[PDB]
Amino acid sequence: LMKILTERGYSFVTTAEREIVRDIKEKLCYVALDFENEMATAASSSSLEKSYELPDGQVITIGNERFRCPETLFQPSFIGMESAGIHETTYNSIMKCDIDIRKDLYANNVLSGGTTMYPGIADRMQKEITALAPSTMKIKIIAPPERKYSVWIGGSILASLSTFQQMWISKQEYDEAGPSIVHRKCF
Amino acid sequence: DDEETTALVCDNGSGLVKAGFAGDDAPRAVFPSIVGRPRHQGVMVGMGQKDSYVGDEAQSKRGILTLKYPIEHGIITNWDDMEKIWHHTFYNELRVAPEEHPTLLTEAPLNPKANREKMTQIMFETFNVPAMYVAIQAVLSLYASGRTTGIVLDSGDGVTHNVPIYEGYALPHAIMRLDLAGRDLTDYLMKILTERGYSFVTTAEREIVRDIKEKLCYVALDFENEMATAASSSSLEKSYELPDGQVITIGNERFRCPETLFQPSFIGMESAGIHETTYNSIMKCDIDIRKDLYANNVLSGGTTMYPGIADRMQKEITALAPSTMKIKIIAPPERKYSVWIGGSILASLSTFQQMWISKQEYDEAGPSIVHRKCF
Amino acid sequence: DDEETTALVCDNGSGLVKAGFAGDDAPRAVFPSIVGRPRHQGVMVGMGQKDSYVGDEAQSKRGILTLKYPIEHGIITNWDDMEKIWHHTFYNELRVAPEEHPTLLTEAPLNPKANREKMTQIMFETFNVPAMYVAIQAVLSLYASGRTTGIVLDSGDGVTHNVPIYEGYALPHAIMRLDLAGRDLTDYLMKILTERGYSFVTTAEREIVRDIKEKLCYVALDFENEMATAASSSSLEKSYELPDGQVITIGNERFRCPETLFQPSFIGMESAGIHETTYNSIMKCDIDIRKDLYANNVLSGGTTMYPGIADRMQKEITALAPSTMKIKIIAPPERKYSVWIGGSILASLSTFQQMWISKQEYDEAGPSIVHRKCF
Amino acid sequence: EDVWEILRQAPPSEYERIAFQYGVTDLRGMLKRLKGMRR
Amino acid sequence: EDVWEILRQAPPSEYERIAFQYGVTDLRGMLKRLKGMRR
Amino acid sequence: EDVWEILRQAPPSEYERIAFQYGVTDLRGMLKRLKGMRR
């Protein structure tokens, strides 16, 4: 984002400048399911062509970026990363999974991560997995809105899992085994 | 909470252990003879994640849980496995106390005695059934045949014998096994399909493949002209949905799996086809039993449920038998249960309770009792 | 400009394609089986910036150019890649016309036929070699063994099979593959080192790591006491210059990479170690072949060049074999070339030119010819 | 058939002979139904 | 649902199986409310 | 050794038997040198 907006007419490098930009993403930046027809849409689609108040008081104008920021998670080309999109990471994982876990996945295609809170997140998730998955199987990605806290929530659970206090790292246990204790048969 | 008892018709069908009661009509027990080990142990809250509930659930746990037959080769390598196998039976699907219901025991020949010795005593102690009793799976089917004369071809759950018989009269000398097991065919299938473009090794991968055989894999009577047929016959050229969701494509295999039971060359086995096992047996049989056979050419074994099974049976015996005599192989559809059925009969044979393995009889003679004048 | 011809001993060593001629002594061809894609295209004056000269130059272009095996899993996913791979060979390093020099073809088992079908015809047309001929890489090493009896353990360029053999006599039934590839070990290495404090994913990053294994990574015979050794053994605790110029530090990995070939647990693979693959094979072998094996326990595969390779081989077989019998695994240092060597032999085997794949023979029988009574 | 009455009046065990004489290879079955009755 | 009573009477840890059987991916939540009760 | 003369006078293909009899697992090599000669 900094890359683009700055080169696109902006001078946006500063730490809290990064602050504003991250705010920008997490408030307005999105993604559209498609790109190339979505690209043509961008070619003139005025609705997106919206400027947002820069918290200096400026109103940063916004267009194709709002989505052309995140989507590269499926194409690091934009980050230039050698890596591959999140989706096919999912898919090669699943193919690694046993033969018929895959439907398990399809019902259990749990997304996690709030910053990914953007639009269509699953929208793509499913569409591409489709594009890759056998329609034989029925997919379903899973992503609560509350994915930030989810991790906290489940931790609150486990730790709160009374039947489980045996695991906690006791001062002593460390003491006898120093820290290295932590590793085997414990973490 | 009822009258005297019902014997416990428990049948470890070479692939699945199965059972009902005496006089029962359907083995209320049927399920895989495997044990299952997960690998990884994702640290998972709570429990309920059994190491070894294979029974009939574990295939739900297929993949992570591995596979273990105890009788692997119709050979119980381990028992506690099979032990809790029983308990599973008697307490989840039998969900029943052994101690008060008699049971007959299903066994194929070729077993070193202590196998039964141990199974027996432990069945008394762990089980305290009113009394047990064993019986050759082979013989069990035999009565399950009721054609007391003639051989039976027992290529069943995963087993294979020839069972020459004659109003109950069978010659063990002429009697034989074919190591082949539908598992074996499974094997060559994996061989072929995998090398043919597939990567198919995993335990439940074997599961799918065995399913494949028992649902689609067949045999054509002939081969070589049948081979040419295969050369372009598109009808066979059918892909089946791989239970991943893939649709495994299928051609010549569907039949080129089983047929080797007549030519272990494909399994590379030194042995010979089932048919001529039958035939050399029969020739061993007395001069004119042979027509008895011909009317009594009883196949047995569901995995052999494939097409043409008799079709060949007869054609080759023909190819060998004197047309003078008239052949007839015998194979009910219900050959799995047949063995169970005849066992249900015998055990259910009231005029016969004298045979059952009594706690005491063992006790005085320990297990060794079992052997002479009893089994 | 010479006499009849020299067959073309061309060997796509599972990682590198390599080759010489019949009667040659050193495969004059050796180089990576990859294809390479740059990303960015800085607008660069002029040209000469090939997309896909991987051959042996591209690693010069590593980083920007990515990596592509066509036979990735000993499985040619693509051919034109491999096609120009050949041309590269025949015209830059072979720099030689196929049309006038015969060639034997190196292959591992498990290949669906059309792979060879296509390779064959296209080799004729694009290549018009005087005639070709294929041969199992496995078998090629086998003669490359010359101990015509006994198995060979082929864990080579990136391959793995057991090759039971007996004066040329091998049982495919007992014969097997281990999907493991030095690439695989590569993998777990990346896993470990990266998670252990490293960020090591990139194609040539994999390059460095494979270099690391093949130069320094080893195995110690034992593990658990060997593990304690690792617990503080400073000698192993050696950092190696990362070819960036960093000096990658190294400890327990150097050995904890390969050893899992005996325990895929680490690769998490359901499979079993190479050794007991050997052993179950041998047990499959006839009763007393086994001593034959023991004298013929031929390893094959350079990537397995690590320490102790046999050291374990023997120790575990011991752990399994009857000390009655005396074991001896066989592994020349030169196992990469061995396969090439034996191929150079066979093809160079003048008494044998009858086998080569003639243009015509194909022509009349198309490619399908290749299969029966020929390969 | 009379196999019913004959077997009920067959000699006690030789229902063997009578069932398998009158085609009843399921003397097995004849008794197993007789057992669902007498089981 | 009975998931309440079943889980209260579920086997102690296998509330896992019962909650996730009756759709309660928040066995997590079932226990976390049970913990706000027992926390 | 005489493996040289024996193999040169070995039966044409059974240099197999003679080489591998006299320890020459490199009948492979025996022929490959014989081929660098006859290649």
Rounded Cα distance between C58 and C39, Å, is: 14
Tokens of D1: 């058939």
CB atoms within 10 A of CB A182: 13
Closest to B140 (Cα-Cα) out of B292, B290, B12: B12
- DSSP per-residue codes, B169-214: ---TTT-EE----HHHHHHHHHHHHHHTT----SHHHHHHHHHHHH
Partner-chain contact F28 C146, CB within 8 Å: yes
Name the residue facing F26 among C146, C168, C348 (closest C-beta). Answer: C146
D with F: touching (≥3 Cβ pairs within 8 Å):
no
Contacts of B87 (CB under 8 A, 6+ apart): B126
State the burial class of residue B124 (Cβ atoms within 10 Å of its Cβ: 0-12, 13-18, 19+). Answer: buried
Cβ contact B132:B86 at 8 Å: no
Partner-chain contact A83 C201, CB within 8 Å: yes
Rounded Cα distance between C287 and A12, Å, is: 79
All residues of chain C having their beta carbon less than 8 Å from the beta carbon of residue B268 are: 171-173
Strand-pair partners of B298: B152, B330
Strand-pair partners of F24: none
3-state SS assignment for residue C305:
coil
Torsion angle of C-alpha atoms B255, B257, B260, B261, degrees rounded to 10: -100
**For chain A, how big is the Rg over CA atoms in Å?**
22
Strand-pair partners of B324: none
Name the DSSP class of B91: I
All residues of chain B having their beta carbon less than 8 Å from the beta carbon of residue C286 are: none
Q: Which chains touch D (3 or more CB pairs under 8 A)?
A: B
The amino acid at C94 = L
Closest to B259 (Cα-Cα) out of B295, B300, B227, B211: B227
Query: In b/e form, how buried is each residue of B185-199, taking b as 16+ CB within 10 angstroms?
Result: bbbbbbbbbbbbbbe
Cβ contact C90:C328 at 8 Å: no
Q: What ranges make up the beta strands (E) of C121-263? A: 131-136, 152-154, 161-162, 176-177, 238-241, 247-250
C-alpha dist (Å) from residue C265 to A78, B65, C251, C259, C309: 37, 14, 20, 11, 19
Name the DSSP class of C355: G
Q: Positive or negative, the Cα torsion across B171, B173, B178, B181?
A: positive
Cβ contact B10:B341 at 8 Å: no
Partner-chain contact B197 C112, CB within 8 Å: yes
- The experimental technique used to determine this model is cryo-EM
Rounded Cα distance between C273 and B8, Å, is: 43
Cβ contact B293:B343 at 8 Å: no
Partner-chain contact A99 B247, CB within 8 Å: no
CA angle C355, C359, C364 (to 5 degrees): 95
CA C255 to mean position of chain CA atoms: 20
Cβ contact C117:C367 at 8 Å: yes
Strand-pair partners of B105: B10, B134
Cβ contact D12:D24 at 8 Å: no
C with E: touching (≥3 Cβ pairs within 8 Å):
no
Strand-pair partners of C135: C106
Contacts of B324 (CB under 8 A, 6+ apart): none
Rounded Cα distance between B274 and B160, Å, is: 9
Strand-pair partners of B357: B132
CA D14 to mean position of chain CA atoms: 9
Partner-chain contact B21 D39, CB within 8 Å: yes
Torsion angle of C-alpha atoms B348, B349, B354, B358, degrees rounded to 10: -10
All residues of chain E having their beta carbon less than 8 Å from the beta carbon of residue A162 are: 35, 38
State the burial class of residue A122 (Cβ atoms within 10 Å of its Cβ: 0-12, 13-18, 19+). Answer: middle
Name the DSSP class of C103: E
Rounded Cα distance between F1 and F18, Å, is: 11
Resolution in angstrom units: 8.0
For the packed helices C182-195 and C203-215, what is the interaxial angle rounded to 10 degrees?
Answer: 100
Cβ contact C165:C172 at 8 Å: no
Rounded Cα distance between B184 and B258, Å, is: 9
Cβ contact B276:B316 at 8 Å: yes
Which residues does A contribute to its contact with E (CB < 8 Å)?
153-154, 156-157, 160-163
- DSSP per-residue codes, E4-25: HHHHHSS-TTTHHHHHHHTT-T
Which of E7, E14, E30 is the best residue to mutate to test the B interface, defined by the most B CB atoms within 10 Å of its own CB?
E14
Phi and psi at residue B211, in whole multiples of 5°? -55, -45
For the packed helices C335-348 and C137-145, what is the interaxial angle rounded to 10 degrees?
Answer: 90
Closest to A35 (Cα-Cα) out of A132, A117, A123, A139: A123
- HEC-encoded secondary structure of chain F: CCHHHHHHCCCCCCHHHHHHHCCCCCHHHHHHHHHHHHC
Relative to beta strand B103-107, strand B131-136 is: parallel
CA angle C207, C193, C253 (to 5 degrees): 95
Rounded Cα distance between B215 and B257, Å, is: 13
User: Which helix (H) or strand (E) segment is B254 a member of?
Assistant: helix B253-256
Across the beta sheet with C152-154, the strand order is C176-177, C161-162, C152-154, C297-300, C329-330
CB atoms within 10 A of CB C112: 14
Nearest CA in chain B to E11: B48
User: In the B/C pair of chains, how many CB contacts fall below 8 A?
Assistant: 20
> In angstroms, what separates the C-alpha of B251 from chain C's closest C-alpha?
14
CB atoms within 10 A of CB C17: 26
All residues of chain C having their beta carbon less than 8 Å from the beta carbon of residue F20 are: 146-148, 167
CA angle B33, B34, B38 (to 5 degrees): 165
Partner-chain contact A98 B242, CB within 8 Å: no
Name the residue facing F25 among C147, C348, C350 (closest C-beta). Answer: C147
Rounded Cα distance between B59 and B66, Å, is: 9
State the burial class of residue A131 (Cβ atoms within 10 Å of its Cβ: 0-12, 13-18, 19+). Answer: exposed
From first CA to last CA, the distance across chain F in angstroms is 24
User: Which helix (H) or strand (E) segment is E27 a member of?
Assistant: helix E27-38
Cβ contact C29:C20 at 8 Å: yes
Closest to C357 (Cα-Cα) out of C12, C102, C96, C6: C102
Which residues does C contribute to its contact with B (CB < 8 Å)?
109-112, 171-173, 265, 268, 270-271
Contacts of A123 (CB under 8 A, 6+ apart): A33
Rounded Cα distance between C195 and B81, Å, is: 39
B with A: touching (≥3 Cβ pairs within 8 Å):
yes
Name the DSSP class of C330: E
The amino acid at C197 = G
Cβ contact C168:C47 at 8 Å: no
Ramachandran area for residue B298 (φ above 0: left; ψ -120 to 50: alpha; else beta): beta
Cβ contact C196:C190 at 8 Å: no
Partner-chain contact E14 B45, CB within 8 Å: no
Rounded Cα distance between A84 and A75, Å, is: 6
Name the residue facing D16 among B22, B148, B350 (closest C-beta). Answer: B148
Nearest CA in chain B to E15: B46
